[PDB]
């Protein structure tokens, strides 16, 4: 994560490191939402233009890491996919509309002080924290610099505000849709930040001032370059997709 901080121990339990088995190396983030379901970005799995297309067998799942590199032995947990579902209206062909994917573990997960799930929002909560002004937190182990192509050795946190619809659409040339949201400081707000290459799937959470629990608002989906002025990054809109999620997880 570009312009982040170093995560703190146990600070973000629902984080998942999606592992490419061979060559052994990082793919993307994920979020534990339960003890056997994980949510990532669809284009982490499939992205035909670069010939990305993995199976429940090309990936390894790492729960409870901090260090990018180190195989933290009695902390960390490694799991393997039983299934993987990509949102059928995932637009790989245009602008990545509905970059939501669900992968179901073969077995459930042990929740340690380090392995713990994040809540999904309610039309209720969705409605009052998702608003320009409000900062959400983004997390990951991908590229530090837009162009360093480098990587953090420990989880990275970065807290960015949620930007205004136009602002965003006026920001890029791409087709922005109702299932996206952009986040960040304006070219003049004298703070930086951003997620970047290697950070897809990772959660963009928000802490409810009411019920005081951590929720997932976005899924790091796309952007243009990294921590670039007057240019914001996009996150899958999880609550608009909350029913497909509801749906696959049941049956």
């Amino acid at each position: 994560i570009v312009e982040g901080s170093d995560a703190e121990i146990g600070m973000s339990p629902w984080q998942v490191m999606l592992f490419r088995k061979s060559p052994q190396e990082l793919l993307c983030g994920a979020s534990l939402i339960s003890d056997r379901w994980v949510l990532t970005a669809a284009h982490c799995l499939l992205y035909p233009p670069w010939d990305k297309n993995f199976t429940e067998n090309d990936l390894l799942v790492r729960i409870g890491k901090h260090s990018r590199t180190r195989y933290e032995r009695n902390i960390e947990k490694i799991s393997m996919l039983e299934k993987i579902y990509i949102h059928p209206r995932y637009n790989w062909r245009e602008n990545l509309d509905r970059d939501i994917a669900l992968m179901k573990l073969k077995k459930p997960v042990a929740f340690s002080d380090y392995i713990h799930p994040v809540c999904l929002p309610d039309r209720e909560t969705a409605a009052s924290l998702l608003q320009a002004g409000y900062k959400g937190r983004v997390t990951g182990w991908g590229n530090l610099k837009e162009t360093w192509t480098g990587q953090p050795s420990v989880l990275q946190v970065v807290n960015l505000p949620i930007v205004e619809r136009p602002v965003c659409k006026d920001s890029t040339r791409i087709r922005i849709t109702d299932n996206m949201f952009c986040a960040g400081y304006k070219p003049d707000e004298g703070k930086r930040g951003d997620a970047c290459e290697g950070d897809s799937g990772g959660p963009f959470v928000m802490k409810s001032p009411f019920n005081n629990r951590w929720y997932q608002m976005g899924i790091v989906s796309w952007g243009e370059g990294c921590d670039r002025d007057g240019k914001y990054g996009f996150y899958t809109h999880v609550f608009r997709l909350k029913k497909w999620i509801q749906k696959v997880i049941d049956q």
Binding site: G10, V118, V157, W214, Y215
Partner: peptide
């Protein structure tokens, strides 16, 4: 259902280095 409440924080009932920031952004 226990969700979003952090063993080492929300339970021990400690705040993390920068969540005050967030909470301060709302309202």
């Amino acid at each position: 259902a226990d969700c979003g409440l952090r063993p080492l924080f929300e339970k021990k009932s400690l705040e993390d280095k920068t969540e005050r920031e967030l909470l301060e952004s709302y309202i």
